[PDB]
């Protein structure tokens, strides 16, 4: 009844406060933020940038036109040649700035060979133009390609279960791929979250404790086509070792599950997460099979993914008791 | 005689059904799909987008021209200035929209300083223009660069063999690189696939079982220039431990082989796969050498890659028997 | 009192000298440098490139105009057609070159069907134009996206502490994430730096010695949301094994701490670093908790991140003594 | 005296022959090749593509102009409007095609509202135009960014040495970073190459044998600022175990050394290689220190990198003898 540190969607429930350097540290990493903001903001931002360069140069050109005396003779004649043809005022100067930076260049307003400063400005503005474009491309490219989007076609079981496999008592949860694209170099991790006090009397607000999914033997690496059921064998070195079915409806703790892997197309690691509270773990259940064979191939029924069935055959005590008891019977 | 879970090309034989959230989960990951569809579709899609913005703006301009009364005086005179010169109708309005968004800007149809709304629209459309381009670039860039294409210059042997190496009985298959480019940080994995029932009576439609290629000792990492022969030593902890040559023509199971590595040029992980059925494994054979030395260098003959030869010297029983028997003789 | 090999910001304090091949080796890797230089330099560089192609082609066109005799008849008539209309001199030839390469193409200066060489040149220059753009985009894209920028939203504690946890004496330092974005596949490393002489009398100017953070058990991998305290248990195989609280104010050595992980958005590994001198390590202290629970969620107070408190309960001798002593008492 | 499998530059000495599917497998991976070819080829290729689309469309337009009867009335009048203004022939049709696809759009040749087919063609060509650009960008971007270029600022010692460290006999070679940029998540690998015959009489043309650099303890991971000396301790499980100083001037084999790591700026793994023949290994030597301290910092003299000095104190027998002998003395 304490609270949820990671929601079921993987979303983490926490907030940072009194971060001192936040503004100056965010300026240096500035690109990283820019790509996480809503599109409309990233866009409006860029159109803001465009608009600003158009107005700036537009003004310069208008200033030049004003001083040269072009405003009064925009088209020139035999005895007089303007800096930029057909700039009669502000809006005209604005239009030419846009036409130039965008490279539309209708040509009705046009630079002449007269002013080196007008020429120069055109030069500068062109270069400027490319620069802004380049940033926009990259930004869009980057944001467009974010691998965290892939985590939404990855799936966790609504519950985790505990049950026997091959003589061992195991915590299990299930994972699945909702795309026919592969998750490359995928692997998993699990952790038990809960506050604790060390024998020295040190309070750890939330301690994160590894749940061994087979990392040592290289078994945490998975090949995920059909849903895989992930197994934690509860043993001497397990944090759940002394926990029984009744300890599940009493205790407060949380199990955090991770799936890391690479989006096949971009080879960019995505990390998917979810969470099981002690009250979301079903003791004595087993997952319903989603895979079955038909004729020339295999199929997965995904409506059975979350479903579990009761195994009355399941022991209600902790692995600890289970073990210790084995050594009474076997001891006498 | 059951069926093949992964084809020989690496293609997986399975299909997902009754996935509930598929539409809304695919919208969030939408970029990931977009790059896997056939070119013509991704392209037609984008030309569809272009076409749509040209028509949309074209319409706006035509509406503006209509209301301003430009349709009747497209070129204007001393007493009258149009919003956009030379828009006499729909097609004219269309052309200007394209000329503008594409930045061709022939200039025959041209914005004037008269309408702020025409100007604004031009502004908006330009910005819009960049945006669509940017998406196209990224999409093409991404799709163009997909690392899974590299898996087609990587190679597996048509068969796997079992045979003795240095006193040990080993399952072996071969892998090869068809490019002179390196596969960076490459490593392998193998798995035995087959359905099973746990001693608790739990049916696992297909259980995936690790075949140890040396992960523990860091030996699953390979340096692949010439074809490497991959070895699984069949021992106490091997899933093939109790399997003999006769069990091979009887049993139904499958071995799945993986090669993961990085495309040298892009450093993007590609994953190559293939499969050996118990009936594709040749007991008592050995691979033909594809590498030989000549003068100033080494050469690889790839026509010998798949070829195997008989070793009548090979034991036909399981590693299990082989071991157990050693301990009769050595026991008496 | 020797010196600092890595500053606290992670910056390494060292310089390379008498590198022989530096110029020719840097030319081959040239792209890598280009993206690390200040913007203004990368930009000025590119505008330098632009400017150079505009002048080059501008000259060609002017040469062509000169020879054709266009300088004297820029607009032509019934009996004479220029190579490029309206090029009356250098600046005119310059303007057309820019208009062409930038694709502004106002159109006042325009190629005609007369000179195949003018046409060809236009062809060449256009192609050239794209090429330079493409480089600029990539450069900007690349530099824009550098993952090392992310290391500035990652955090280390100003000090490291030594203290007891669960019956063991541990060196600890703390790490934190200043963004709500995740650090994917993150893990840590630590090293003791100091010069030494092997029993063979070989001097190692600075030897780098692994500080075990749990790599073997897969515990060096972390899930970083709230600040994690990193623990080195000082034991038989620890380089700090024979060090006590008094050895800390005497000895000269340095501990180097690393955090490697992936920027969530780009999946590009960043590496963060910092350093603790023996004089920056606080013996007998403990970190102040930055995480606390409120109602519907958790919060982190970052002003407590660096803060430590005294634990007078802490032993002042080395793990070595501590152990050895245990085996007097337990031995008698 | 056999031959070198990897040259000292890392270049591998081998060639593939009789690869059967080479053309069709290379078509699918086609992008991968495109980026490894010389610039001039990738460029000429693209200019080839451009040129081809300009000519193609140019022809279409000319065909349209021909049929419409524009060739005879390029500028039109009150009673007649051309498809595209000012196309009088082939070259004119060519110019307009280029002006259109490049978006220069001088405007002297210009589409009119008359032909829907001309309009359509313009539409199509524009779209086409973007597509080719996009490919070019990506290609240039990709090729520009190749991480294998970084391997040229990474360094190996010209020789490897064997010598005692802390009571153990070790094969050592040295590695170095020629840039002030870091090599992220770097690690090493080594291998002994030589042909062999298994006790079963199976010939392995070249067997690749792991040289343990500490992978098991996680010590193959390095932090490379100053040059690191890499150590292989020659022990029971070492392939060099039974090799002595005299076996070095006799035997033929090769040691292959690898350094894998990530370019700091792009986080793209590069793999550096080199090789030591038994005749390139200096028994009884030690590397000259390249690092020294001065005042406020550290410096590296790179001219000392390759240099080694004699240690007459060094044993000339194999680790094997060395060990076995220890157990005579200690045995009697
Ligand atoms: C015309 C200008 C129209 C315009 O400005 O934006 C419209 C549209 C919506 O973007 P919008 O501003 O609503 O921003 C997204 C919105 O919040 C989504 O619901 C988020 O998904 P999720 O719920 O968090 O998963 C997403 O998160 P993330 O993606 O930031 O993580 C946000 O970016 O943007 C396009 O799709 C590209 C259109 C290209 C044309
Ligand atoms: C003009 C417009 C012409 C046009 O629209 O497409 C033509 C052509 C064919 O593409 P197309 O639509 O046939 O799509 C590809 C086709 O299915 C291949 O056979 C697939 O290879 P594989 O058998 O699965 O290995 C490939 O798979 P993947 O690549 O999706 O995985 C598909 O993309 O596309 C270009 O090559 C780029 C041309 C650039 C100009
Ligand atoms: C107009 C032309 C204006 C122009 O030429 O540059 C201005 C500005 C400053 O760049 P500038 O030349 O000062 O170069 C950066 C400056 O040294 C920063 O302080 C560095 O940060 P840090 O202290 O090392 O962390 C940074 O390091 P790194 O990033 O190289 O590592 C340097 O690149 O550049 C833009 O931001 C993009 C503007 C886009 C418009
Ligand atoms: C104008 C058109 C001029 C033009 O077409 O090319 C000139 C120039 C040379 O390229 P070039 O054709 O000589 O091709 C490179 C040449 O072989 C290098 O010596 C190679 O380096 P290395 O010895 O193998 O290390 C390199 O290998 P890799 O890079 O393929 O691995 C080759 O690409 O290309 C540019 O630098 C970009 C210029 C941008 C303007
Ligand atoms: K234009
Ligand atoms: K134009
Ligand atoms: K243009
Ligand atoms: K124009």
From Swiss-Prot, chains A, B, C, D:
Residues 64-89, 107-115 are extracellular. The chain crosses the membrane at residues 37-63, 116-143. K(+) 2 binds at residues 103-104. Residues 144-328 are cytoplasmic. Residues 90-106 dip into the membrane without crossing it. One of its GO terms (molecular function) is identical protein binding. It is a multi-pass membrane protein. Keywords: Cell membrane, Disulfide bond, Ion channel, Ion transport, Membrane, Potassium, Potassium transport, Transmembrane, Transmembrane helix, Transport, Voltage-gated channel. Activated by phosphatidylinositol 4,5-bisphosphate (PtdIns(4,5)P2). PtdIns(4,5)P2 binding to the cytoplasmic side of the channel triggers a conformation change leading to channel opening. A motif (Selectivity filter) lies at residues 103-108. The keyword Membrane applies. The keyword Cell membrane applies. K(+) 1 binds at residue 103. It catalyses: K(+)(in) = K(+)(out). Disulfide bonds join 83-115. It comes from the Eukaryota. K(+) 4 binds at residues 105-106. K(+) 3 binds at residues 104-105. It is found in: Membrane; Cell membrane; Cell membrane, Sarcolemma, T-tubule. GO terms for biological process: potassium ion import across plasma membrane; potassium ion transport; protein homotetramerization; regulation of monoatomic ion transmembrane transport. Inward rectifying potassium channel that probably participates in controlling the resting membrane potential in electrically excitable cells. Probably participates in establishing action potential waveform and excitability of neuronal and muscle tissues. Inward rectifier potassium channels are characterized by a greater tendency to allow potassium to flow into the cell rather than out of it. Their voltage dependence is regulated by the concentration of extracellular potassium; as external potassium is raised, the voltage range of the channel opening shifts to more positive voltages. Belongs to the inward rectifier-type potassium channel family. Homotetramer. This is ATP-sensitive inward rectifier potassium channel 12. It comes from Gallus gallus (Chicken). The lineage of its organism: Eukaryota, Metazoa, Chordata, Craniata, Vertebrata. The gene is KCNJ12. The chain holds residues 41 to 368 of 429 of the full protein.
């Amino acid at each position: 009844c304490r609270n949820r540190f990671v929601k079921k969607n993987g979303q983490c429930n926490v907030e940072f406060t009194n971060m001192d350097d936040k503004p100056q540290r965010y300026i240096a990493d500035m690109f990283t933020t820019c790509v996480d903001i809503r599109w409309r903001y990233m866009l409006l931002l860029f159109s803001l940038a465009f608009l600003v360069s158009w107005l700036l140069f537009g003004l310069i050109f208008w200033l030049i036109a004003l001083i040269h005396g072009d405003l009064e003779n925009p088209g020139g004649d035999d005895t007089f040649k303007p800096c930029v043809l057909q700039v009669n005022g502000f809006v005209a100067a604005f239009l030419f700035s846009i036409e130039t930076q965008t490279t539309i260049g209708y040509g009705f307003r046009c630079v002449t060979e007269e002013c080196p400063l007008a020429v120069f400005m055109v030069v500068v503005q062109s270069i400027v133009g490319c620069i802004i474009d380049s940033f926009m491309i990259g930004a869009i490219m980057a944001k467009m390609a974010r691998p965290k989007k892939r985590a939404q076609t990855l799936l966790f079981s609504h519950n985790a279960v505990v049950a026997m496999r091959d003589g061992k008592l195991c915590l299990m949860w299930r994972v699945g791929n909702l795309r026919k694209s592969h998750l490359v170099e995928a692997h998993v991790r699990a952790q038990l979250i809960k506050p604790r006090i060390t024998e020295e009397g040190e309070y750890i607000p939330l301690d994160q404790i590894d749940i061994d999914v087979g990392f040592d033997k290289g078994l945490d690496r998975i090949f995920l086509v059909s849903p895989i059921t992930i197994l934690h064998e509860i043993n001497e070195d397990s944090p759940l070792f002394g926990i029984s079915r009744q300890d599940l409806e009493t205790d407060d703790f949380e199990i955090v599950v991770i799936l890391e892997g690479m989006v096949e197309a971009t080879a960019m690691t995505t990390q998917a997460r979810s969470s099981y509270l002690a009250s979301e773990i079903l003791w004595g259940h087993r997952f319903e099979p989603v895979l079955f064979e038909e004729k020339n191939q295999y199929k997965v029924d995904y409506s059975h993914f979350h479903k579990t069935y009761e195994v009355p055959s399941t022991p209600r005590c902790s692995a600890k008791d289970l073990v210790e008891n084995k050594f009474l019977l076997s001891n006498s």
